[PDB]
Each structure stands twice: as C-alpha cells, then as structure tokens.
Design a protein around this ligand. Structure first.
Ligand code: A1B3B
Ligand code: A1B3B
Lengths: 301, 301
C-alpha cells in the first residue's frame, strides 16, 4: 500500500535525447530512427524572437547550420524541414536505442511523465497533467526546451509533449510531437496568458477512491447527489463538469469500494462546501487532481 | 520556474533489475557486474516466517536452487553468500549495462528515488525520504521486495535502499545494499511498529527557500529567533530539532535569497502557529519536508 505521484521508468526515452545547436542557441532534441525532433524556435535568434518569420529563418538555413550531438559524438545532419512548430533534422545514423514508439496527442485531464533535460542530458523525471487550460505545471529552467512528455503502454512509448515555453504565471506550454500546440499559444517572445484553470473533477474522484482503498474514509457520508445537482456545485467552484462517460470510467473503483460515484460526488460536494475541517486525505490538505482513474488502478494493482 | 517532486532518471537502474526465484518465492534483484543482490527472505518458506534461521536455511541451498532471469535469459548462478539481510548470488555473466555505482548508507531526512519493480520489471519511479523513524512512505505491493532506492551524481548511481517489508501503518522498511536495516526492524513476520513520525525541519526550511526563489514571500515576517527558541517551539508540533549543522547547510540558500536562516525559522514558527489560512506554498497546503537543501539547489534557478 501507500500512494505516490509516480512517473513511468524513463530509460527508453533517455536513450533518445540529444543536444541540438543552431548559431548560439542550444536545446534538447529527440532522436528516433534517423530524425531528430526539436522546437522550431531553435533557428530563432534574440533579434527575431519578438516577431519571428519561421519560413524565412528556415529558408536562409542549410544542413550545415545545425549541430546535433549524442553524448560524445556528432551526428551529421543530411536534411532539414519543419512541421508546424517542430523542426525535423535528418541525420546519417539511425538511433540504435530507438524504442517501439507512437506520437499521440493527449486530452486535457490526461497525465504523462516529463523527462526534464539540459544540453541533451536527462536531469530529472516527474509526473504531471495536461490542465483544462492546456498548460502544464512543470518545473523547467533555461535550456529545457525540447524536453519530452510520454506514457508507456506495454513496450511502446507514446510521446505526447515537447516543451517550448513558460508563461508569466510560471506554468508551461508546448506541442505534441507533430508540432501542434496544446492551447492558444504561439512560439514568440510576446505577452501570453493562460485561461482561468479549472479542476479535473474525474481525477479528484479517482483520488478519493485511492484514498478509500488506502483506508482514509472520514469524508464518506450516507448521502447521494444527482449529476445535475453536482454539476451546479462543480460550476460554482471552477470544477470541470462531470459527464456520464466519467461516471462509467470510475465503475471499477466504485464496484471495488462499495461507494457509488454519485455517493463520492456527494462527499466531494461536501468537501467543496465545508473544506477539510483540518484533516488530510493521502498526506494532502488539498484535493489532488493529477491522478487519472487509470493511474489509480495502475498503482493500486 | 515551477517546483515538482522530481525523481532521478531511472534508465541506469532499469538495466540492472532482474527476477530471482527460490522455491515458490519470486522477487526482484539488482544485477551489478557478476553479482545479483536481493533480500535474503527469498529463501524463507511460509512456515519459516516467524523465526527463520537464515544461516541454517542457506546452507541447505545449492546454486541451482536459485533461478535468475534477465528479460528471457536465465543467468546461471555459480556462487552464493549472505551479507546481513541481503543475499549475494554470483552469476556467470557480468551485466553489460552495469553503470558506475557506489553503495551508501543514508541518514534520516535524506531523499532518494525508488524504482518500483514486479517480477524484475520496472513499473514506476517516485521520490521519497528516509523518515526520522527510519521508515519510508513508499508505494509497494506484493512482489515489490528487492526494489531499490538510489541517487545519481555525475553518471554514478548511489544505491541506498533495498525494499524488504511493509509495517502495520502502511509504511515501508528496508536495508542499505550491505544488508543492514534502517531502524530497529527485522526481516521476520513478528510484531513490529514504526515509532511516532516527526517532520524533517531542515527540509521544510529548504522548501520555504525554494518558495522564495520561485517568487513567493507571503509567509515571511519581520521577526527573528534564537536557534534555542526555535527548537522549543518547533518540537511542540512534532518537528525534529534543527542543529547548527542544519543551519550551516542552509547557508547557500540563505545567501541567494538574502534571508537569514534564523529569519526563515521565525517565518516557519508563524506558519505553524497560524496555518496557511486558505493560501498555498508551491502548490501545497501543508509544509513539505521531502526536499533537502541539495534537492532545492539542484532543481531551482
Ligand atoms: C513567452 C515565452 C515565449 C517565454 N516566456 C518567458 O520568458 C517568461 F516570461 F514566461 F519567463 C519563454 O518561455 N521563452 C523561452 C525561454 N527559454 C527557455 O529555455 C525556458 C524554458 N522553460 C522555462 C524557462 C524558465 C526560465 C527561463 N527560460 C526558460 C528559451 C527559449 C525561449 C523562447 C521560446 C519560444 F517558444 C519562442 C521564443 Cl522566440 C523564445
Ligand atoms: C512484518 C512484515 C515482515 C510483513 N508485513 C506485515 O505483516 C504487515 F505489517 F504489512 F501486515 C511484510 O512486509 N511481509 C512481506 C510482504 N511481502 C511483499 O511482497 C510486500 C512488500 N511490500 C509491500 C507489500 C504490500 C502488501 C503485500 N505484500 C507486500 C512478501 C514478503 C513478506 C516478508 C518480508 C520479510 F522481510 C520477511 C518475511 Cl518472513 C516475509
């Protein structure tokens, strides 16, 4: 027992991280087969960062404008192109450590592991969630661009995130591996702000279940709510609406614990209205929303 | 910006995890060079559980009584010995993925990463701390024994923890890689309990410094404290004593923020007295004690 924020093992991804240099910009690249993926802003200098014309910055460049370095060794760049906000550099050598992989785009509410990297070297791994406002609450410093987020299913690495930027509130934005942003953001040095965030209701409920499973039960009551009454309360507290699909998804945990979802919803409604009355749930004095139902099942089995 | 519970990249350790079976017992082992380390209780049957004599059980075993599997490959065992509570199995193949490593024994308050494994297969990575009562608040199920805790410093893996057991309160106990337990615990199914846990004061202080570095000052106050007065108050909330050593260790963070250590102690005393009153620090509504000064420096700007 016990319940922790857990990331996937990161070895398969560490084997793919490289350093990409263009002029005096350095950041991280993902090396899969014979192509390296990195943010397109690598080709941008500070003079242009304010209002970059990527087409024009790229047209001016050749293979020899990029240097790719995997640990000790230079990879020779033999082609280059851009897909949305990602630069693709073709190299003369396939990565022998390439895992079975897919590129997937995730939905808000879904979680993934981030391997934070600097100068092409993996430095730490943590778990986070795609927020409803399409940011992530990461931990990222200068040089972290091109770090990736991933999930693992079987032996297959699903890459879902590449890091591009930080917003004024201190949260992070990036793209999928095909270079489409999550959220209404652009890759230029300009004032941009995240929309009001909301809480991921379904995840909170999942985590309440994990709490029950670990013997934290003080927040249960005899009562039950409806979906419609619950959503009225949710709306009030900037929680995402709970849909019938969410209810379905929690079916396993509901049957496992003997607490019906609309019962858990009544608990959660009470917690929103009254607070925790000085108590904690799973070592937390706030309602945690970065664990999915699947994560809860994964860890509790 | 941002601050996250961050683990070390697990790849170097993933390449060392194997499965060890003896009789009907299967658990995890750590394959370094031509040695597999695992908990000695792998040789205990369901009858031996209360008062096993491990020396007596081991002398009855042949090399061929132990099955070691790495992926699909059987490793032939060609020798065995016991050191304290760890079994060492000599195998005929040195692990080609052996990283640079050391074995270290850590002290209460120190943090490390855990690679949770089942059947020799890594399933997740998380960060935790050696509690003052010599337990860790892990997340482990049946079959997790042999999972290890580690730090990485400059490509060198410091292994500091091997998982052996769970206590009644749901927390976890184990040994260093020389097989000495942390704490008074024993590898027997006899009645054992964790002593009262206390908060790692030096770590809470470090984490307040992290909050300042990250741009939040709301909890500071105009006061200072003597070290003695600090301890007399903090111990009333079950916090560990802060020592002159701790104070020296916080000097770097003191210098970067310009807040004297004793001033930060005054801030903590007030937090303990007042609570958060609806506010958070670094995303948390309680005082986090599982980041060391070193962890904060590592992760922070
Ligand atoms: C409005 C945003 C575009 C901007 N935001 C801010 O500067 C602010 F205000 F939020 F800090 C931003 O993230 N600029 C990045 C910063 N950077 C990093 O390595 C970096 C990454 N993650 C967190 C950090 C924390 C501290 C310092 N650095 C980082 C280098 C590349 C640069 C960039 C990205 C891009 F997509 C397009 C262009 Cl042209 C330039
Ligand atoms: C007093 C403790 C010795 C005992 N715990 C209790 O009795 C308590 F307190 F949990 F009820 C305990 O941990 N037994 C372990 C359990 N185990 C696990 O795989 C295991 C590991 N981590 C978490 C789990 C969570 C759920 C189920 N299993 C696990 C198999 C091996 C066994 C063992 C270890 C040992 F060192 C000596 C002997 Cl002879 C037997």
């Amino acid at each position: 027992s016990g319940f922790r924020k857990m990331a996937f093992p990161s070895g398969k991804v560490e084997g793919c991280m490289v350093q990409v240099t263009c002029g005096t910009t350095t950041l991280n690249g993902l090396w899969l087969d014979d192509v390296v993926y990195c943010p397109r802003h690598v080709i941008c200098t500070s003079e242009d960062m304010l209002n970059p014309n990527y087409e024009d910055l790229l047209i001016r460049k050749s293979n020899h404008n990029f240097l790719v370095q995997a640990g000790n060794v230079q990879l020779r760049v033999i082609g280059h192109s851009m897909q949305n906000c990602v630069l693709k550099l073709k190299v003369d050598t396939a990565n022998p450590k390439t895992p079975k992989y897919k590129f997937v785009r995730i939905q808000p509410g879904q979680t993934f592991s981030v391997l934070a990297c600097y100068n092409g070297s993996p430095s730490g791994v943590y778990q986070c969630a795609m927020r409803p406002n399409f940011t992530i609450k990461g931990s990222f410093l200068n040089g972290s661009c091109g770090s990736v987020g991933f999930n693992i299913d079987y032996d297959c690495v699903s890459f879902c995130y590449m890091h591009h930027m930080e917003l004024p509130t201190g949260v992070h934005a990036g793209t999928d591996l095909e270079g489409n942003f999550y959220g209404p953001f652009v890759d230029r040095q300009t004032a941009q702000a995240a929309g009001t965030d909301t809480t991921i209701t379904v995840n909170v409920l999942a985590w309440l279940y994990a709490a029950v499973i670990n013997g934290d039960r003080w927040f249960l009551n005899r009562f039950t709510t409806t979906l419609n009454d619950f959503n009225l309360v949710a709306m009030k507290y900037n929680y995402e609406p709970l849909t019938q699909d969410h209810v379905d998804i929690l079916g396993p945990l509901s049957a496992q614990t003997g607490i019906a979802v609309l019962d858990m919803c009544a608990s959660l409604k009470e917690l929103l209205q009254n607070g925790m009355n000085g108590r904690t749930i799973l070592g937390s004095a706030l309602l945690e929303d970065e664990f999915t139902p699947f994560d809860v099942v994964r860890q509790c089995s």
